[PDB]
């Protein structure tokens, strides 16, 4: 016994003092220090706080601007909505949770918080997948006379939700569950226990395989052709340098996000994986809580790349904000 086990909780602290309670019933203040809790709640607000207005504003800009109807504007407007949903659904749940030191909103709270946070992170993954292939099709242009235009950009946003709901939602009904994490304040997938009546073994494997490994091999794949193209398979293709210049500033943007995603999300992925092998080992609440709350910048950083790296958007947004002169 290196923590505690219950119906729907695992608290990584030896109930040898009998101080350990459920994160649905009582304040887990015993798990560490008060200042550390209202430290995370102060970080949830700040996230909500740069997130809410930059994601809506992402939406607000694409809204007003009719020239933003391309593959790239689409996927990101999508992401803004993926982010905001974390901000309002997943985040306001965890915020409140940090300031009282437990899920007072009960198990159904641990759903919401953990759902959107699994959603916004996976949408972000699958969208990258779509992105990787669009750049593939538009730069490697490998199939016959084709157009990646307005129509596929709605097939793609619709594909990403499809495969984030394929991962985030199965714990809601009967395949694995959403369970408290580290300082218990954050909630995520049940890796820490078998719990056979939900199939937490099959779910996890799948969850990594389908919704981590695979999408990466595809994004690594689309990468492998673009390295090939720009070297010597984009020589005979004749693309005018003008076209390349701006289209490169659109290639780069994809992979920045590829990396940034992995930078905020590999710490998590790896830490989760590590528990799964060592089911019920010696470790502390501080272990998962860090790559957790950190990782939730995924509701913010995406727009921020789009703000920094894309000149067009940067001149659309600005133009919304003076109201006229620095359009679409
Ligand atoms: C970690 O250990 C603590 C204490 O070592 C557990 O709390 C204890 O929970 C039991 C079971 O609910 C309490 O016993 C109750 O006593 C009355 C006797 O009149 C009985 O009628 C009730 O039905 C119940 O059996 C016990 O008082 C309580 N101990 C105290 C005072 O701390 C705790 O549940 C453990 N953590 C978990 C969630 O595994
Ligand atoms: C709880 O954590 C402890 C580490 O503190 C682990 O207990 C080890 O048990 C194995 C036997 O398989 C021994 O090789 C080690 O001597 C133990 N370590 C210590 C420091 O006591 C264990 O992995 C965890 N779970 C158990 C079985 O209690
Ligand atoms: C995004 C992502 C994943 C989802 C992680 C989860 C379950 C997130 C949910 C809540 C969090 C991380 C709260 C903090 C997979 C499975 C790990 C692997 C890498 C990509
Ligand atoms: C904290 C996240 C940022 C997004 C919220 C921005 C909303 C307020 C924008 C006001 C900008 C004022 C610009 C006036 C300059 C001109 O002239
Ligand atoms: C509502 C909070 C989300 C953040 C989005 C910003 C909305 C505020 C409106 C900004 C528009 C700029 C107004 C023009 C200034 C004058 O001139």
Where residue 282 falls (left for φ over 0; alpha for ψ -120 to 50; beta otherwise) is beta
| CB of 270 shorter than 6 A to ligand 4 | no
Output the six-digit token pair for 251.
Answer: 């290639």
Can you spell out the DSSP letters for 241-264?
HHHHHHHHHHHHHHHHHHHHHHHH
Other beta carbons within 10 Å of 86: 30
How remote is the CA of residue 297 from the centroid of ligand 3, in Å?
12
Angstrom distance (rounded) from CA 268 to CA 292? 6
> What CATH number is associated with residue 125?
1.20.1070.10
Q: Which residue's entry shows tokens 């800009």?
A: 61
Q: Which domain holds residue 286?
A: 1-328
Q: What letter would DSSP give residue 98?
A: H
Contact 40, 91 (CB under 8 A): no
For ligand 4, atom 11, the nearest C-alpha belongs to 321
How many CB atoms lie under 10 A from the CB of residue 315?
A: 13
- What is the DSSP secondary structure assignment for residue 10, as one 8-state letter? B
Report the distance separating Cα 207 and Cα 205, nearest Å.
5
How many distinct structural domains can be found in the chain? Answer: 1
* Token pair of 25 as six digits: 């019933």
- From the CA of 52, give the closest atom in ligand 4: 2
Index of the ligand 4 atom closest to the CA of residue 54: 4
299 Cα–ligand 5 center, Å: 20
CB-side neighbour CA atoms (13 Å) of 321: 12
Q: What method was applied to determine this entry?
A: X-ray
Contact criterion met (CB below 8 Å) for 116 and 44 = no
Contact 64, 324 (CB under 8 A): no
For the beta carbon of residue 147, count every other beta carbon within 10 angstroms. Answer: 9
Q: Coil, helix or strand for 6?
A: coil
HEC profile of 36-89: HHHHHHHHHHHHHHHHHHHHHHHHHHHHHCCCCCCHHHHHHHHHHHHHHHHHHH
Binding residues: 201, 279
Give yes or no for a contact between 19 and 30, defined as CB atoms under 8 angstroms apart: yes
Closest CA to ligand 2's atom 26: 1
C-alpha–C-alpha distance, residues 237 and 27, integer Å:
64
325 alpha carbon to ligand 3 midpoint, in Å? 42
- Measured in Å, residue 7 CA sits from the centre of ligand 1 at 15
Cα atoms in the 13 Å half-sphere on the side-chain side of 158:
6
Residue 289 CA to residue 309 CA, distance in Å, equals: 31
- Report DSSP letters for 192-212, one per residue: S---TTTTHHHHHHHHHIIII
- Name which residue sits closest to atom 10 of ligand 5, judged by CA: 321
Residue 127 CA to ligand 4 centre (angstroms): 28
Among candidates 261, 267, 309, which has minimal Cα distance to 123? Answer: 261
What residues have CB less than 8 Å from 186, skipping those under 6 apart?
Answer: 94, 113, 114, 117, 180, 288, 289, 292, 293, 296
Residue closest by Cα to atom 1 of ligand 3: 121
The residue among 151, 194, 158 whose CA lies nearest residue 176 is: 194
Please work out whether the CB of residue 268 comes within 6 Å of at least one atom of ligand 3: yes
Dmax over Cα atoms in the chain, in whole Å? 73
Q: Is 240 helix (H, G, I), strand (E, B) or coil?
A: coil
Tokens of 131: 């992105």
The answer to whether 120 touches 88, Cβ cutoff 8 Å, is no
Contacts with 243 (C-beta within 8 Å, 6 or more apart), sequence order: none
Ligand 3 pocket check: which of 178, 268, 269 to mutate, most ligand atoms within 8 Å of Cβ?
A: 268
Pairing of strands 186-189, 178-181: antiparallel
Block residue for tokens 């340098």: 241
Q: Residue 91: CA atoms inside 13 Å, Cβ hemisphere, count?
A: 28
* Quoted resolution (Å): 3.8
Question: How many whole angstroms separate alpha carbon 281 and alpha carbon 279?
Answer: 6
State whether the Cα torsion 107-21-43-187 is positive or negative.
negative
The candidate with the shortest Cα–Cα distance to 135, out of 226, 37, 29, is 226
Task: Tell me the CA–centroid distance for residue 145 and ligand 3, in Å.
Answer: 38
Do the beta carbons of residue 80 and residue 56 sit within 8 Å? yes
């Amino acid at each position: 016994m290196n923590g505690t086990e219950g119906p729907n909780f695992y608290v990584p602290f030896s109930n040898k003092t009998g101080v350990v309670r459920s994160p649905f019933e009582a304040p887990q203040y015993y798990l560490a220090e008060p200042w550390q809790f209202s430290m995370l709640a102060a970080y949830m607000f700040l996230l909500i706080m740069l997130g809410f207005p930059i994601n809506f504003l992402t939406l607000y800009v694409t809204v007003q601007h009719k020239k933003l109807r391309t593959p790239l504007n689409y996927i990101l407007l999508n992401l803004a909505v993926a982010d905001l949903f974390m901000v309002f659904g997943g985040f306001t749940t965890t915020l409140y949770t940090s300031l009282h030191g437990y899920f007072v909103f009960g198990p159904t709270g641990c759903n919401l918080e953990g759902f959107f946070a699994t959603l916004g992170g996976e949408i972000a993954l699958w969208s990258l997948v779509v992105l990787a292939i669009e750049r593939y099709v538009v730069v490697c242009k490998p199939m016959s006379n084709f157009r990646f235009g307005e129509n596929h950009a709605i097939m793609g946003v619709a594909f990403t939700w499809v495969m984030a709901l394929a991962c985030a939602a199965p714990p809601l009904v009967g395949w694995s569950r959403y369970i408290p994490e580290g300082m218990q304040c954050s909630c995520g997938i049940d890796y820490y226990t078998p719990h056979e009546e939900t199939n937490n073994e099959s779910f996890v494997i799948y969850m990594f395989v389908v919704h981590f490994i695979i999408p990466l091999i595809v994004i690594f794949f689309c990468y492998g052709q673009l390295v090939f193209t720009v070297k010597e398979a984009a020589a005979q293709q004749q693309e005018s340098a003008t076209t390349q210049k701006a289209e490169k500033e659109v290639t780069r943007m994809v992979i920045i996000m590829v990396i940034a995603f992995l930078i905020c999300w590999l710490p998590y992925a790896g830490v989760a994986f590590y528990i799964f092998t060592h089911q019920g080992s010696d470790f502390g609440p501080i272990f998962m809580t860090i790559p957790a709350f950190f990782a939730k910048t995924s509701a913010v950083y995406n727009p921020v790349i789009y703000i920094m790296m894309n000149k067009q958007f940067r001149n659309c947004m600005v133009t919304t904000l003076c109201c006229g002169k620095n359009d679409d």
